[PDB]
Amino acid sequence: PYANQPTVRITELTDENVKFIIENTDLAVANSIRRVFIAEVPIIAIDWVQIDANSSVLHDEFIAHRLGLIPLTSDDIVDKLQYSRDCTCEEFCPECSVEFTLDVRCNEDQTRHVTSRDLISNSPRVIPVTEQDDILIVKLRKGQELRLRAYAKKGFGKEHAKWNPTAGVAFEYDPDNALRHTVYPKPEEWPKSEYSELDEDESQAPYDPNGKPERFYYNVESCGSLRPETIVLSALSGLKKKLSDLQTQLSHEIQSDV
Amino acid sequence: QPMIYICGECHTENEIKSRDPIRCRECGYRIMYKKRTKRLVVFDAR
Amino acid sequence: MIIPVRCFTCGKIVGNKWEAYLGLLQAEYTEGDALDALGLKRYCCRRMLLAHVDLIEKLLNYAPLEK
Amino acid sequence: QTVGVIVRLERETFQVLNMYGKVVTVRHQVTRKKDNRFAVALDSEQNNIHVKDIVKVIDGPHSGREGEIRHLFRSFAFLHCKKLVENGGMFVCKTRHLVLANELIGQTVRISQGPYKGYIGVVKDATESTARVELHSTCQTISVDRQRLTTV
Amino acid sequence: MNAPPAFESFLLFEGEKKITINKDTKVPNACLFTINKEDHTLGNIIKSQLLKDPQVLFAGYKVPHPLEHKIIIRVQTTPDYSPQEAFTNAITDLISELSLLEERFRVAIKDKQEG
Ligand SMILES: [Zn+2]
Ligand SMILES: [Zn+2]
Ligand SMILES: [Zn+2]
Structure with a gap:
């Protein structure tokens, strides 16, 4: 009934990009943080x-x-x-x-x-x-x-x-598709991801039905208008601000109904 | 009251009159180009 | 005509790369070596210089109408 | 300053009856005034009257006759009567002696308030309330309030 | 010509409510939340958070049209539990985990830049 606790692990930080891993959050939270990198950062x-x-x-x-x-x-x-x-x-x-x-x-x-x-x-x-x-x-x-x-x-x-701070936001979850969201016809032809951890004998990971998308890998490359970490900080602040204004309008509408 | 036209090939500028035959003074070139307007332009950079 | 300021897909600033790209071509590199010497990893940023035609140098030959 | 009503068509002149009641003879080259077929006037008894209304004359030089309103003035009304053989039936009475039987156009403005703030355009149409602005930047003409505009 | 201006994605106008609650009449304890001037970047997170309650029986959202900027979030919750309460708990849970995520991102930056 409540929000899981996400966590961040930064693999590198350069003046161009930032590469990090967000664990223990849902898919839609992760996609929205990507979409707020692309759009909602002023x-x-x-x-x-x-x-x-x-x-x-x-x-x-x-x-x-x-x-x-x-x-x-x-x-x-x-x-x-x-x-x-x-x-x-x-x-x-x-x-x-x-x-x-x-x-x-x-x-x-x-x-x-x-x-x-x-x-x-x-x-x-x-x-x-x-x-x-x-x-x-x-x-x-x-x-x-x-x-x-x-x-x-x-x-x-x-x-x-022209108000887009990001050059490129690479985003991937489950790089060996244990979830099997994508279904390769012949997985031997497919190249492994950067974040794959299978040996070269194995093509893709075994399926688990009880799994869920977690451990989201991001690569946020800035265009230079912002440092690549203040894109992420400004995005999180903007998404929390959008949700807070939605909650304020929600409180007004509930008080209007009652 | 005179209009300033740019003299085509000559690229110099000269006055013009109403009911005036269109001729340059440098070499009598027949094509004049009207100067860019003096009022403001503003472009949305979109 | 002139080089685009941003790559159309990414938004990577590619407009500052063109004169250095010409410098790396005339300094006897391949085009593929010149691109990742300029640091263009994604192929959508590589097509922006690899297939640009610098047409404004043809347009600057003509004498300016206004002067 | 004074309108007229033609009562006789001639070869080189017109016989014209003005609001004064004075039949005059003027040249062909008077001007055609736009007629107001929806104009309103008041009679002596404060009833609303219009054109083609059969009205009785209770006061003035023509008191006793009854004619049809054909044209209107600020304070004069022209009456036609087929029985009255003078002037083709036309005469005039004052209306109070009867009884019923922009600047902003083409001016470079700058939207100084709202979502389009900072755009330079030219006013195409304008009202008391709003005004249409041809935007110099986009390919689109949009309407804003006059309180939002600031001229150059 | 008929290009909608670029501020139509997110700016409201006079006489536009940001959120509109309409109580559904087909099933008990269900509401349609019409959010004006938003997109998938709000309703997708709200849908995924409302699926995490054990007391929401249905949590969906749709855009009616991608050229008209509004979403509808349909919520059906268990009886004794109002869907407005589930919605205002989903927003607080998102603000909770995003503020926690922002603080952990700050700490990870301080770890990375200072060795
Ligand atoms: Zn000349
Ligand atoms: Zn690119
Ligand atoms: Zn200001």
């Missing part, structure tokens, strides 16, 4: 692009699109920012947005690469993530230019895929 991404001038070969909406998908360092600001549509400001402010300015004219015979470095924030914490090279926004011939002001705002992955 980050900071550009959403309001004002093109002051443009002479580049790419048109305006293509440049605003490419400025959308640039990841921004939002490791601690996104907990402080309000959602833009929730703020009481005069339609933009530093409490719900981060200002960016790009001002590039090519005055040379070399093809000048307007990269992500030319995005200049007023907030020193929210900067584009780019060791690695910068993200190419637009190339420029001599004579061409672009000037724009771009406001970034808090949002999450259901709204648009």
